[PDB]
Amino acid sequence: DIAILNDYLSAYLQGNKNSLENQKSSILFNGIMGMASSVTGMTSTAGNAVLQMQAMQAKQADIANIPPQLTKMGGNTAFDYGNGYRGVYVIKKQLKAEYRRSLSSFFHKYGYKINRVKKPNLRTRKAFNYVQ
Amino acid sequence: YGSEYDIVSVENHKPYDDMMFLVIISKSIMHGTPGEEESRLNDINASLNGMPQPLCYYIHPFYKDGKVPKTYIGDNNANLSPIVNMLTNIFSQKSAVNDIVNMYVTDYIGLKLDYKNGDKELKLDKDMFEQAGIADDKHGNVDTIFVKKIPDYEALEIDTGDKWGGFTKDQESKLMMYPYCVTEITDFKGNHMNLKTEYINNSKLKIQVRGSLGVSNKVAYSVQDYNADSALSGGNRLTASLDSSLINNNPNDIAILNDYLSAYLQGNKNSLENQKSSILFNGIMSTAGNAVLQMQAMQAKQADIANIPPQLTKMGGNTAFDYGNGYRGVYVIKKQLKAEYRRSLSSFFHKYGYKINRVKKPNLRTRKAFNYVQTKDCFISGDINNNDLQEIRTIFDNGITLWHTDNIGNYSVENELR
Amino acid sequence: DIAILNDYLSAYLQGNKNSLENQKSSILFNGIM
Amino acid sequence: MPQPLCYYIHPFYKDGKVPKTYIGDNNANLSPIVNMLTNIFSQKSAVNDIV
Amino acid sequence: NSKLKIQVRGSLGVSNKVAYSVQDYNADSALSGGNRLTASLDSSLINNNPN
């Protein structure tokens, strides 16, 4: 909305002195925001070795990727078009290089999790095939 | 890593330093200019102001003393009146009283100005601004600034220096990472953003200020290098930086009319006071390998330190309170874990290294004194009978400390690199 | 409904059109995962 | 939908400039925005029943 | 600090606003007095009540 010369408009801007209203929402629950009895007596099958690696690398939490300032973004139209915010934006995001490196090395050695009933890929790669 | 952070460093940055800007919005022209072919007084004047604007618009700089910087518009001294004198004058003038819509103060109008803070002097663009004479009560002509045309707003950068400066450095470097340390940026007016310094793609914390001259105050402080890819262009970084920047939506307006409506929401001033701010809420709160695991378990992270003040909600709203006590611009608050937990975690990291969780060949001789090494399903080859080779594999699979100095067991050393 | 009158009131809640816009719609929340 | 309100649109660039606009085969002869806004809000009778 | 010291800050705005702070709370030993008070708002008690 753009301001509109009227008898009405000064009433319109106490409508926006209702920015003191953005206080409850833009805060989120930011307050909220490996297998030790293994191993002994095998030791140790390649499978349970991987399981422990999964346990030690266990996902503690997902990356929200929801900005807590969404609440405050659209209020001022003069601000938006002034600083060149207009139309749609496509932001492609991917994990930090440290974890790419980390996860890539893991997937490379011991393949992906499958959870299907089938006959296994025994000779698909040029060098090696892991199978459990 | 504890229950609370230490506040190790505090710094404050203001876009125009000592200079602030008062802002007046009206329906019609209230002023006169040197040499104008026509009193523009009381006329409707639409203008570009971030966007096509039907409103008339007045700007006036000031310092906390109340005096105003020597201001040139083009090559002409605008002859700016002291702030309180104009305010008295603008609200005493017959016409001006009835179509002044709103008034607020801002730390950044949306332009990098030619401002020398040393000599308290400001030069303005001949084309965007104009000398504005509001003159007459019984008398007293005051000079201020009318905004002619501001088609595009721009950003102003702030260099706060070394991103890691302020933190008391411990020799285990990981204790400088999140969540052990965190750089907080806040305007102390209800807007607040935590940053993981390690993920600032720069050696320096650089802040980008963006502003507006809209109907109310709106300023945003950004850190465009935060979570930016190495190969991301500057413009693109600034654009996307809004997601993790600090947006001062707070209306820094000063009051102008009781009516019926102002009173009614002063009837409902209290309703906005029923915050629940601290009911908000929190949500409150014998191999070497397994030896370490149990050690990880006994000091297991029970809870993360939120670092969102439950009193954030109440910080803005009162402009007279904020500027009275000197709350203005953006503040960079660097926090680090309590000394007690640093000792604890540092001592642990020193003996048994960091958690790694990636597949590589192990660091066996990187430190001067010792290297701890634990593996899982490790592969060790070589010209050795497969029985013995199989045993060596299990040795590293179970964890082992490899000494490089004859003083074995002396963990008091630094054990640095090389 | 389709609009029929500005008055003072229609404008005031167009003053508060934005307030209903401060949804928190994707900070809503999930409780994700 | 069936709307009882009168309705006006005007194209613009951030510059303030206006694209050459033809309505059918006729040059609409569009005024710059800043001029119009000034003009539309200056007519007092019409102004206060702009929704 | 060995003592609980409270810092009272006020205003004469359009409504009542007083804040009680404890500037030594979570303050680094080497943090200046002004900075302690400055940052103390996060962990202060802000009487936003209009009265």
From Swiss-Prot, chain B:
Q: Where in the cell is it found?
A: Virion
What keywords would UniProt list here?
Late protein, Pore-mediated penetration of viral genome into host cell, Viral genome ejection through host cell envelope, Viral penetration into host cytoplasm, Viral short tail ejection system, Viral tail protein, Viral tail tube protein, Virion, Virus entry into host cell
One GO biological process this protein is involved in is: symbiont genome ejection through host cell envelope, short tail mechanism
| One Gene Ontology cellular component | virus tail
Q: Which domain of life is it from?
A: Viruses
Keyword Lipid metabolism present in the record's keywords: the answer is no
Could you tell me which cysteines form disulfide bridges?
none
Subunit and partners: Homohexamer; forms a hexameric tube structure with six flexible hydrophobic loops.
Function description: Distal (knob) tail protein that plugs the end of the tube before DNA ejection and forms a channel perforating the host membrane during ejection.
This chain's protein is named: Tail knob protein gp9
Q: Which organism is it from?
A: Bacillus phage phi29 (Bacteriophage phi-29)
Q: Which residues of the full protein are shown?
A: 153 to 599 of 599
From Swiss-Prot, chain E:
> Where does the chain cross the membrane?
none
Q: Which domain of life is it from?
A: Viruses
- What is the protein named? Tail knob protein gp9
**Quaternary structure per UniProt?**
Homohexamer; forms a hexameric tube structure with six flexible hydrophobic loops.
Give the function comment from the record. Distal (knob) tail protein that plugs the end of the tube before DNA ejection and forms a channel perforating the host membrane during ejection.
Corresponding gene?
9
Residue spans making up a coiled coil are none
**Where is the protein found, in the record's own terms?**
Virion
Q: Tell me the stretch of the parent sequence this chain holds.
A: 354 to 404 of 599
